[PDB]
Structures are given as C-alpha cells and as structure tokens.
C-alpha cells in the first residue's frame, strides 16, 4: 500500500570542514531507524533507491550547472572548499553529486511505483534536500531540485501536461521551485514558510504572497508567509482549511509531491516555530484526499534529529492508513498569521473560484 525509499549511501554526502553542520548524515538514518522502533517499515514496501541520469536532470537543469556539480566528485579538499563558497550556504564533499543523484532518483523510482499502481503512496528519507536548488545554481544545502525534478519525470511517463501539486510545508521558501515552475500551469506550486518580511532566510521577496506566478503561470504559485510570530499546529490548519484544499480541490492534481521539510516543528535550530508531529499527520492526512490517494512525501529540512524522527514517522503512520489525530481547530490564531492568510486569499481570489 506504502512505499518507502531509503538508502545509507546517501550518508556519505558531509561537511569536511565543520562536523557538526545541521545538515548530518544522521538525518536519514535517525528517521529510518525510528521507522524500525515504531515497527513502520515492516508495513511499507521498500522501493529501491538508483541514480538519476544526467538526461533527467535536464529536465529542471542546466548543463553547466549539472557538469559543475558533477566535477566536484573527483575535486582536491582544496577545491571542494573554494566552489562550495561560490555558492548560498553549501558544502560540497566527494560523495556529494552521488547522493545528490541517489536522492532524485530514489524519489523518481517512488513516483514511478505510485504511477503503475504498485503502491498508493510513498515515502522518501533522502539528503541532501533539493528545493533551494535552481535551473542554474545549488543553494542552501541543495544541489538538485528533487521536488521539481520529480514532478518533470512524472510527466515524462505519463502524461507531458499531468497536474502535479507540490506542497511545500519546509519552514524555509523553496526558491528554486518556485523558480522552476513559475510560468508553468501544469505543476501548482504552494509553499508555507516564514518569511519576516524577507529577513528569513532566503532573504527574498520572491517568498511574498504578491508573486502569483507568471503569465499561464499565474494563479498556480501560492506563497504563504508567516511574519512577526511563532506559528504552530494552529496557523498550519487554518492555512490549509482557508488556502491549500481549496485550491488544491480546484486544479484537482492527478499526483501530489510533499516538499516534506521538518524544520517547522518544535525544537529545531533552524526554525523558531512549534508545529508538532500531530499537526504533520493532519496535513498529511488532509493531502490523501487528493489525487485518488496518490502522495509522494520527500523529505527536505528538519535539523532537530529526535523531532524530524517523530514527524516524519506520523505522516508514514497517516499514508499506512492509521486514524488521523484529532487537533482543535477552534484555536485562536496568532494575529499576523490571520493577515498572513487574508494577504493570500486577496492575492488569489482573482485566479480560484473556490476562494470567491
Ligand atoms: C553557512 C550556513 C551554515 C549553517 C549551518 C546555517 C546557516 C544559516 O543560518 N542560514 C539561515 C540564515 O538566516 N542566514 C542569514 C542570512 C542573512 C545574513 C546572515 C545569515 C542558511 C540556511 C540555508 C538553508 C537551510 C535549509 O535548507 N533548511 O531546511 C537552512 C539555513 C548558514
Ligand atoms: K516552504
Ligand atoms: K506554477
Ligand atoms: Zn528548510
């Protein structure tokens, strides 16, 4: 019913210069292994990981940008420093264009699994995360946009125009998805992220709830900023409840990619906000309404290793089939995220009869 997709060699990617980067090997791992705790896997069928090919990821990508990144695989220490500081916050190792290549792949052997009806739904423990990545350049801890790559590939087996929604709930923007997909009305793009008027990074207007899309784009790229608070669970479902599922009911998406980073919940360095692993499986659960069931949750940020553990294992436990938690929509919302929200209705009501 469940797939999952998970590979160690995807660890061999770290930080030779600062060991206690966030962005650890034992990301991956430490969500695998509670997946084993909670006795998850045993219920999901594992798909294996391959690498992508070079041709795919032309799908998102420049071949300048592709033959950068995959010239470091052989580069001196001396050389890995000097192009990752050509770049927004990356550090690039010898392993790093592999498992680049490991984390897309293993997300396009997972759609393809959901696509020939194998399995329902599926899961994706990859690193590094893809969604800062752009056509052209690697950014914040991404080289490859997996997320954006992976709905190209599924349109490539399927259907050239096949509405593919991309959700993506990381706490930070996914600037190169957005980027990707921007004059694109087949692939709906919406992103919730705190923004603080464009302090957070990636330090962008591009984040704001003003840029809709371009032209046969527009209307199909939602930004919904947080600004000035700490949102939690609360901000998240009135989100959802105002903005994503109606939206998301009107373009009727025939796939459903989860940018699934983690770096929203309780305790995370990266963060600053409280949403919990309850508050996860409700958004996941909310999303299997879509699309005949049909849900790809990758795996972006999340730096709190026992947090990202526990919530990604709840959307797991959602996508298995487990009853969803009961969470009180009757919680008043933080101020600013009541204007957030409204911010984006307004922006939107032009393009979405449901919001109307
Ligand atoms: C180089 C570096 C390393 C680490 C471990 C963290 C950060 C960092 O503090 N950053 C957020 C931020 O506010 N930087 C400001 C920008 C304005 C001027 C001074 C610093 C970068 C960052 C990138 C990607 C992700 C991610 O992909 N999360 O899922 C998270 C953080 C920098
Ligand atoms: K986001
Ligand atoms: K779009
Ligand atoms: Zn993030």
Redesign the pocket.
């Known amino acids: 019913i469940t797939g999952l997709v998970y590979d160690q060699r995807m660890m061999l990617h770290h930080n030779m210069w ?1 060991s206690h ?3 650890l090997p034992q990301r991956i791992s430490r969500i695998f292994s509670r997946h084993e705790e909670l006795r998850l896997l045993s219920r999901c069928h594992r798909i294996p990981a391959r690498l992508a090919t070079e041709e795919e990821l032309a799908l998102c990508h420049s071949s300048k940008h592709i033959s950068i990144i995959k010239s470091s695989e052989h580069m001196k220490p001396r050389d890995l420093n000097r192009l990752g500081d050509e770049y ?2 990356i550090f690039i190792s010898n392993e790093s264009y592999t498992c680049a290549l490991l984390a897309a792949g293993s997300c396009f052997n997972s759609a393809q699994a959901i696509l020939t009806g194998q399995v329902r739904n599926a899961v994706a423990i990859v690193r590094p ?1 893809g969604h ?1 990545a752009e056509k052209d350049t690697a950014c ?3 080289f490859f946009n997996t997320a954006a790559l992976t709905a190209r590939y599924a349109q490539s087996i399927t259907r050239e125009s096949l509405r593919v929604l991309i959700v993506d709930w ?3 923007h996914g600037n190169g998805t957005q980027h990707i997909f921007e004059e694109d009305d087949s692939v709906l793009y919406i992103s919730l992220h705190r923004y603080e008027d464009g ?5 962008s207007e591009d984040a704001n709830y003003d840029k809709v899309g371009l032209g046969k784009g527009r209307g199909y790229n939602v930004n919904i900023p947080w600004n000035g608070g700490k949102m939690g669970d609360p901000e998240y479902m009135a989100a959802f409840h105002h903005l994503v599922m109606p939206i998301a009911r009107e373009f009727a998406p025939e796939l459903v990619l989860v940018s699934a ?1 983690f ?1 929203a919940a309780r305790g995370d360095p ?1 963060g600053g906000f409280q949403v919990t692993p309850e508050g996860y499986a409700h958004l996941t659960h909310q999303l299997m309404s879509l699309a005949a069931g049909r849900v790809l949750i990758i795996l ?4 709190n290793l026992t947090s990202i553990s526990e919530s990604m294992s709840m959307c797991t436990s959602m996508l298995l089939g487990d009853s969803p938690p009961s969470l009180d929509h009757l919680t008043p919302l933080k101020t600013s995220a009541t204007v957030s929200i409204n911010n984006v209705l307004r922006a939107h009501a032009p393009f979405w009869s449901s919001l109307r």
């Open positions: 600062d980067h966030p962005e927004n916050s995360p800062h914040g801890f991404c990381d706490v930070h302090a957070f990074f990636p330090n980073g770096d990266l972006e940020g999340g730096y």
